[PDB]
């Protein structure tokens, strides 16, 4: 329904999976939007194809809303609802205060809602990280940047391997399993949950083995007991150092009993035992949950 | 998520359904020219070792595009190429490059890319369509136990349906997939559309019957059909050479 003529560009915001995002306002309605601008020879990039067609299907208060696609022959423009900042930039600003527990709780809860909705609609996000989780001044957090997402089938088949930013990448991808699923998005969320509490990345590795070993040193090296099939996975090595699992109360010390229970389910090695977003919503961690406005900005 | 996804797909397949009549409204192209095109797409898929889902998606795109855009026979292939390009870009880990599509067709690269954008507009970017393949794959989980020949035979019959607009435009992916699954499982094991799938889908042999009669004919007539890329394709070991099995003579319905 749109035309570039009604938007006033306001400032550049950044560069996500592809193209570029600017803050802009609609001159006629007043509405602040984010414009993603796509320069168009492979024609329309698979990322834009995926993002657009999947985002069209996903209309949910915890998924960023695609308002419109303005479709020139030179340029493709995605008009999104505007959100005020991302989770990473918010964690930095809470540097001294810390984020208050009820905000962590509300954001996780909301994130699990948005993920549950994606999984329910056969969509994998595959790039959950603080830079792609956007917050508004009313207390909403929302999943954004679906350029890496995809429509899966039941049961899944082999999909791209090079997937999820390293720090947030699940062990089954690190170990080269030919099948991965919804559980990969949960891993990411688990990591981010840890991160919202400590204000620092849980597994900040610099390479894939460094990533595994950091994961291994916290959750203990997995074996056939904890995770049947591991020792048969393509990139599994019998030479891996074998670390004892650490007590969770030391992984994320400020977390209470319910918090810890939740994170451990979110971080189970075996994708089949890893909690689902759907199931996670009913967890006793969330029993007193509310939706406070962000204590800052 | 198995039930939520299935429910969601049952809703989309209605919204994603082409106009049953469309070919009668096309001045210049016929059911039989679409069959040639689809048969060709099958070759492209085998040449480039594309997923079966990809092919299914392309056919969905072409039918929908053709439901609202009137096309001349000299262009039908242009549409098909772009459709297959978009399906590859959506579905494949490694889509063939634009160049490879230009080469398999002549139209220029500029034409292919312009058509691609046209198809996106006409489809308003709604590319995540349910397919016979997505349904079958779910149905397969109800085999006791899994049998590879049943799966490949079902996929084969499902695919065969892409070729003939009449009659298959009138049936929804989830229904063709059910006829295919029953037909395959019967041909190979003598077993039937199982109870558990009645619970899942709501379909019975009675509701499946119409499509099932058409499928059983398509099957028996398959060696004779002017189009043969699917039969050829399914001689491959990869699909257990199911296209060499004999169709049953009767269904006992
Ligand atoms: N820290 C910041 O400065 C700020 C201010 C605003 C902001 N807003 C907003 N809204 C969107 N709807 C959107 N995408 O859909 C988006 O993408 C921004 C991109 C940036 C590159 C990585 C992916 C996310 N940004 C986001 C951040």
Asked if A56 is an interface residue toward chain B (Cβ–Cβ < 8 A), one would say yes
- Number of other CB atoms surrounding residue A1 within 10 Å: 6
What the block records as the tokens of A175 is 């170990």
Radius of gyration of chain A (CA): 20
Whether A120 and chain B come into contact, CB under 8 Å, resolves to yes
Q: In the beta sheet, which residues pair with residue B82?
A: none
Alpha helices in chain B (DSSP H): 2-15, 31-47, 52-68, 76-91, 98-104, 109-122, 132-140, 148-163, 165-168, 173-189, 195-201, 205-220, 229-233
B145-178 in b/e burial notation, b at 16+ Cβ within 10 A? Answer: eebebbbbbbbbbbbbbbbbbebbbebbbbbbbb
Same domain, B160 and B177: yes
**Structural domains in chain A plus CATH codes:** 4-84 (3.30.200.20), 85-295 (1.10.510.10)
Same domain, B99 and B154: no
Do B76 and B180 have their domain in common?
no
How far apart (Å, rounded) are the C-alpha atoms in residues B56 and B92? 13
CA distances from A151 to A51, A124, B117, B167, B191 (A): 10, 7, 21, 29, 32
Q: Which is it for strands A133-135 and A123-124: parallel, antiparallel or unpaired?
A: unpaired
What is the spatial distance between Cα A26 and Cα A75, in angstroms, rounded to a whole number? 19
Q: Are A79 and A35 in contact (CB under 8 A)?
A: yes
Q: Shortest CA distance to A56 belongs to which of A107, A8, A121?
A: A121
| Token duo for residue B67 | 């439901």
Whose tokens are 């810390």? That residue is A98
Separation CA B38–CA B55 (nearest Å)? 9
Which of B108, B128, B148 is the C-terminal boundary of a domain? B128
Cβ neighbors of A221 (< 8 A, separation 6 or more) are A240, A241, A242, A243
Distance CA A87, CA B90 (A): 29
Residue B189 belongs to domain with CATH number: 1.10.472.10
Least Cα distance to A170 among A156, A189, A153 occurs for A189
**With an 8 Å Cβ cutoff, are A50 and B90 in contact?**
yes
**A42 with A49: CB under 8 angstroms?**
no
Q: Can you tell me the distance from the alpha carbon of A253 to that of A240, in angstroms, rounded to the nearest whole number? A: 27
Q: Do residues B93 and B195 both lie within one domain?
A: no
What tokens appear for A154 in the block? Answer: 């039941």
Handedness of CA B146, B150, B151, B154 (dihedral sign): negative
Question: Do B68 and B135 fall within a single domain?
Answer: no
Q: Which residue in B has a C-alpha nearest to residue A75's C-alpha? A: B117
Strand partners, A17: none
Q: For testing the chain B interface, which of A59, A118, A151 should be mutated: the one with the most B CBs within 10 Å?
A: A151
Q: Which residues of A53-92 are buried (b: 16+ CB within 10 A; e: fewer)?
A: bbbebbebebbbebbebbbeeeebbbbbbbbbbbbeebbe
Among residues B146, B144, B196, B201, the alpha carbon closest in space to that of B177 is found at B201
Atom of ligand 1 nearest to the CA of A81: 12
CA distance B53 to B88: 9
Query: Nearest Cα to A187, choosing from A271, A120, A284, A62?
Result: A271
List the one residue out of B133, B122, B188 whose CA is nearest residue B161.
B133
Q: Is A244 exposed, middle or buried (0-12, 13-18, 19+ CB in 10 A)?
A: exposed
A38 touches chain B (CB under 8 A): no
Q: Which of B53, B121, B128 sits opposite A57 (nearest CB)?
A: B128
Report the alpha-carbon distance of residue B224 to residue B23 in Å, rounded.
Answer: 23
DSSP per-residue letters across B173-229:
HHHHHHHHHHHHHHHHHS--S-HHHHHHH---HHHHHHHHHHHHHHHHTGGGSS--H
The single-letter DSSP state of residue A175 is T
Instruction: Give the C-alpha separation, A275 to A282, whole Å.
Output: 11
Same domain, residue pair B202 and B123: no
Q: Among partner residues B53, B85, B125, which is closest to A56 by beta-carbon distance? A: B125
What sign does the dihedral B87-B39-B74-B166 (CA atoms) show? negative
Residue A120 and residue B4: Cβ atoms within 8 Å?
yes
Instruction: Kindly give the pairing relationship between strand A85-86 and strand A133-135.
Output: antiparallel
Pairing assessment for the beta strands A150-151 and A123-124 based on DSSP bridges = antiparallel
Half-sphere exposure of B118 (CA within 13 A, CB side): 20
**Do B22 and B166 meet the contact criterion of CB atoms below 8 Å apart?**
no
Does one domain contain both B179 and B192? yes
| Residue B136 · residue B156 · CB < 8 Å | no
| Rounded-to-integer distance, Cα A246 and Cα A263, Å | 13
CA of A18 to the centre of ligand 1 (A): 13
> Are the C-beta atoms of A46 and B90 separated by less than 8 Å?
yes
- What does the alpha-carbon distance between residue A51 and residue B211 come to, in Å, rounded to a whole number? 35
Residues B123, B127, B131, CA angle at the centre, nearest 5°? 115
Is A5 a known ligand-binding residue? no
Domain end: B90, B106, B128, which one? B128
A137 is in an annotated binding site: no
Strands A66-71 and A85-86: unpaired
A14 assigned to a ligand binding site: yes
Contacting residues for A105 by C-beta, under 8 A, at least 6 apart: A285, A286, A288, A289, A290
Technique employed here was: X-ray
Residues 6+ apart with CB under 8 A from B7: none
Same domain for B11 and B35? no
Cβ-proximal residues to B124 (8 Å cutoff; 6+ apart), any chain: A56
Strand partners, A139: none
Give the residue among A275, A168, A242 at the shortest CA–CA distance from A211: A168
* Residue A86 labeled ligand binder: yes
Q: Distances in Å between the alpha carbon of B102 and those of A9, A140, A241, B77, B105?
A: 38, 47, 52, 11, 6
- Are the beta carbons of A174 and A219 closer than 8 angstroms? no
A155 touches chain B (CB under 8 A): yes
B154 and B81 within one domain: no
| Mutation for A interface: B115, B120, B137, B146, most A CBs within 10 A | B120
Chain discontinuities in chain B, listed by preceding residue (C to N exceeding 2.5 Å):
105
DSSP letter for A135, please. Answer: E
Other C-beta atoms closer than 10 Å to the C-beta of A235 total: 12
Asked if A289 has any chain B CB less than 8 Å from its own CB, the reply is no
Whole-number Å distance between alpha carbons of A85 and A141 = 10
Give the SS3 label for residue A291: coil
- Is there a single domain that holds both residue B145 and residue B124? no
Verify cis geometry, omega within 30 degrees of 0, for the bond prior to A64: no
**8 A C-beta contact, residue A68 and residue A1:** yes
Give the pair of three-digit tokens for residue A37: 């601008």
DSSP state of B237: G
Name which of A52, A62, A122, A56 is nearest B7 in CA terms.
Answer: A122
Q: Domain count of chain B?
A: 2
Q: Is-contact A192 A164, C-beta < 8 A?
A: no
Sign, CA dihedral B226-B57-A182-A208, equals positive
Provide the greatest CA pair distance for chain A: 64
Note whether B9 and B64 are same-domain residues: no
What ranges in A168-287 are assigned the alpha helix state H? 171-174, 183-198, 208-219, 248-251, 257-266, 277-280
Q: Each residue of A178-197: b (16+ CB within 10 Å) or e? A: eebbbbbbbbbbbbbbbbbb
**Do residue B147 and residue B248 come from a single domain?**
yes
Three-class DSSP labels, B155-184: HHHHHHHHHCHHHHCCCCHHHHHHHHHHHH
d(CA A196, CA B211): 54
Whole-Å CA distances, B192 to B145, B156, B212: 13, 18, 12
Question: Which residue is associated with the tokens 């996780």?
Answer: A108
Give the residue numbers spanning the domain of B157. 4-17+129-252
Residues B28, B76: Cα–Cα separation, whole Å:
10
- Judge: A160–B134 Cβ closer than 8 Å, yes or no: no
CA dist A35 and B93 (Å) reads: 27
Domain boundary among B101, B128, B155: B128
CB B147 within 8 A of CB A73: no
Pocket test for ligand 1, best of A10, A47, A81, A144 (most atoms within 8 A of CB): A144
Distance of alpha carbon B58 from alpha carbon B43, whole angstroms: 13
Contact A46 B89 (CB under 8 A): yes
């Amino acid at each position: 329904p749109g035309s570039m003529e009604n938007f006033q560009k306001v400032e550049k915001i950044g560069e996500g999976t592809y193209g570029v995002v600017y803050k802009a306002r609609n001159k006629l309605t007043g509405e602040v939007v984010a414009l993603k601008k796509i320069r168009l020879t492979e024609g329309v990039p698979s990322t834009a194809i995926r993002e657009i067609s999947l985002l069209k299907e996903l209309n949910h208060p915890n998924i960023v809303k695609l308002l419109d696609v303005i479709h020139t022959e030179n340029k493709l423009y995605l008009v999104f609802e505007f959100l005020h900042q991302d989770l990473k930039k918010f964690m930095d600003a809470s540097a001294l205060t810390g984020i208050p527990l009820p905000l962590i709780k509300s954001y996780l809860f909301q994130l699990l809602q948005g993920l549950a909705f994606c999984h329910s609609h056969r969509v994998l996000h595959r790039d959950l990280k603080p830079q792609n989780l956007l917050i508004n001044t009313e207390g909403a957090i929302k999943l954004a940047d679906f350029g890496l997402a995809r429509a899966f089938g039941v049961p899944v088949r082999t999909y791209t391997h090079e997937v999820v930013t390293l720090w947030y990448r699940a062990p089954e991808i690190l170990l080269g399993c030919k099948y991965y699923s919804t559980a990969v998005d949960i891993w990411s969320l688990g990591c981010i949950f840890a991160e919202m509490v400590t204000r620092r990345a849980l597994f900040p590795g610099d390479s894939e083995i460094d990533q595994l070993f950091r994961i291994f040193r916290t959750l203990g090296t997995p074996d056939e007991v904890v995770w049947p099939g591991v020792t048969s996975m393509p990139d599994y090595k019998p030479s891996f150092p074998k670390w004892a699992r650490q007590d969770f109360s030391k992984v994320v010390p400020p977390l209470d009993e319910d918090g810890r229970s939740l994170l451990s389910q979110m971080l189970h090695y075996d994708p089949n035992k890893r909690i689902s977003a759907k199931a996670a919503l009913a967890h006793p961690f969330f029993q007193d949950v509310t939706k406070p406005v962000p204590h800052l900005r | 998520y198995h039930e939520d996804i299935h429910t969601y797909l049952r809703e989309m397949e209605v919204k994603c359904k082409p106009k049953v009549g469309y070919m009668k409204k096309q001045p210049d192209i016929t059911n039989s020219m679409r069959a040639i095109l689809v048969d060709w797409l099958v070759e492209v898929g085998e040449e480039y070792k594309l997923q079966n889902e990809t092919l299914h998606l392309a056919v969905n795109y072409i039918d929908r595009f053709l439901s609202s855009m009137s096309v001349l026979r000299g262009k039908l292939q242009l549409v098909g190429t772009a459709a297959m390009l978009l399906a590859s870009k959506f579905e494949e880990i490694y889509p063939p490059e634009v160049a490879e599509f230009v080469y398999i067709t002549t139209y220029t690269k500029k034409q292919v890319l312009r058509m691609e954008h046209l198809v996106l507009k006409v489809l308003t970017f709604d590319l995540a369509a349910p397919t016979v393949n997505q349904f079958l794959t779910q149905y397969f989980l109800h085999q006791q136990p899994a049998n590879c020949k049943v799966e490949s035979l079902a996929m084969f019959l499902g695919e065969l349906s892409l070729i003939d607009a009449d009659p298959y435009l009138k049936y929804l992916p989830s229904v063709i997939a059910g006829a295919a699954f029953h037909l395959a499982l019967y041909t190979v094991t003598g077993q039937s559309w199982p109870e558990s799938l009645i619970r899942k889908t709501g379909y019975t042999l009675e509701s499946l019957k119409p499509c099932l009669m058409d499928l059983h004919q398509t099957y028996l007539k398959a060696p004779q059909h002017a189009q043969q890329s699917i039969r050829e394709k399914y001689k491959n070991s990869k699909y257990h050479g199911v296209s060499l099995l004999n169709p049953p003579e009767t269904l006992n319905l």
